[PDB]
Design a protein around this ligand. Structure first.
Ligand SMILES: O=C(Nc1ccccc1)Nc1cccnc1
Ligand SMILES: [Cl-]
Ligand SMILES: [Cl-]
Ligand SMILES: [Cl-]
Ligand SMILES: [Cl-]
Ligand SMILES: [Mn+2]
Length: 340
């Protein structure tokens, strides 16, 4: 039977089932006011799938100049063509190689650049913005989006959306690396998975994907969604409550000191965007500081809602295309205020 919603994370995470249901706000606003993230499934079925394929991005935009990042070591690959990223998205033998001769795990940095998404891709902009869930919160002019309504005493988000494109992490050593390292945003965000690639060349690495989800602390009902094999898994997220951010800073100051970093007692390891919390660090956070997070597997068509101030990290299981929009809900406007 079709149902309005379900629970993941043992009852701690709302999962809405119908992205365009006009009654979603009633269930949503009770969880959102408590500082929880929310998942909405099925957004891919609302979109024009031919607009979100890696081959179309390569054909239409392949000649633009860009920088990439090597996810394994943070090295920057400067001033290459965007087709050099897209043509290796799914075919491993076509990826740029490190000195060791291995194909690299790459992230495409700042593309489309700054606020240029709408001008560069007007048809993609329309398809995404017209199908975002919770539209009173997420649309630029929604009644519960204060972004366009606040004075300069508040940090306002840039005009979006922003596109996040990166290969999947592959090996046992890769399990300790982030696609996006631990950080926080002063605005709310909605992040939609519009394309996932489960490919070949080295296609048979489902076994390391299982171990990553399991060691990532994913719940049995998410474990049931994985092993059902109906839907495409994309990325593993860890999100933490905004109220826990300082305890996370204390853990990362102590670890930086144990690893012989030389850091002033006040420095901000979350703002630095330099850490990924692996299984060891997540267990230490829980045991030594009392802090529990949400381990979320984002499948094709899942929209993840991230509360303002909430620290969060992302680990791609396969090659992903994500598109995110920032907004300012009344529940969380304190997080962007410039005084006290
Ligand atoms: O491939 C998976 N699902 C899927 C693939 C194609 C089409 C529809 C669904 N799940 C999975 C399970 C274990 C390890 N890696 C991935
Ligand atoms: Cl809050
Ligand atoms: Cl377009
Ligand atoms: Cl709404
Ligand atoms: Cl990062
Ligand atoms: Mn973010």
């Amino acid at each position: 039977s079709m149902t309005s919603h379900s629970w993941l994370c043992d009852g701690r995470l709302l999962c809405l089932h119908d992205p365009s249901n006009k009654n979603n706000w009633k269930i949503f606003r009770e969880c959102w006011k408590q500082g929880q993230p929310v998942l909405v499934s099925g957004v891919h079925k609302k979109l024009k799938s031919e607009l979100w394929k890696p081959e179309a991005f390569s054909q239409e935009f392949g000649d633009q100049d860009v920088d990439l990042v090597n996810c394994r070591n943070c090295a920057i690959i400067s001033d290459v063509k965007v087709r050099d990223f897209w043509d290796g998205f799914e075919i491993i033998c076509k990826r740029l190689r490190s000195e060791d001769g291995q194909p690299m795990v790459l992230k495409l940095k700042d593309w489309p650049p700054g606020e240029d998404f709408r001008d560069m891709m007007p048809t993609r902009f329309e398809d995404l913005m017209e199908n975002l869930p919770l539209p009173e919160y997420t649309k630029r002019d929604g009644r519960l989006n204060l972004a366009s309504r606040l004075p300069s005493y508040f940090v306002r988000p840039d005009l979006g959306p922003k596109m996040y494109n990166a290969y999947g992490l592959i090996t046992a050593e890769d399990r300790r690396v982030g696609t996006t390292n631990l950080h926080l945003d002063v605005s709310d965000a909605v992040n939609v998975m519009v394309y996932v690639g489960i490919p070949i060349g080295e296609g048979a690495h489902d076994e390391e994907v299982l171990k990553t989800i399991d060691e990532g602390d994913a719940d049995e009902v998410t474990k049931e969604r994985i092993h059902d094999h109906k839907e495409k898994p994309g990325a593993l997220w860890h999100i933490y409550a905004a109220k826990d951010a300082e305890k996370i800073r204390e853990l990362l100051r102590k670890v930086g000191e144990e690893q012989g970093q030389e850091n002033p007692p006040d420095h901000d390891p979350i703002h630095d965007q330099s850490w990924y919390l692996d299984q060891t660090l997540r267990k230490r956070l829980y045991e030594e500081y009392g802090v529990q997070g949400w381990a979320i597997v984002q499948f094709l068509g899942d929209a993840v809602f991230i509360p303002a101030g909430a620290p969060h990290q992302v680990h791609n299981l396969y090659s992903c295309i994500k598109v995110a929009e920032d907004f300012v809900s009344p529940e969380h406007v304190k997080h962007c205020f410039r005084l006290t």
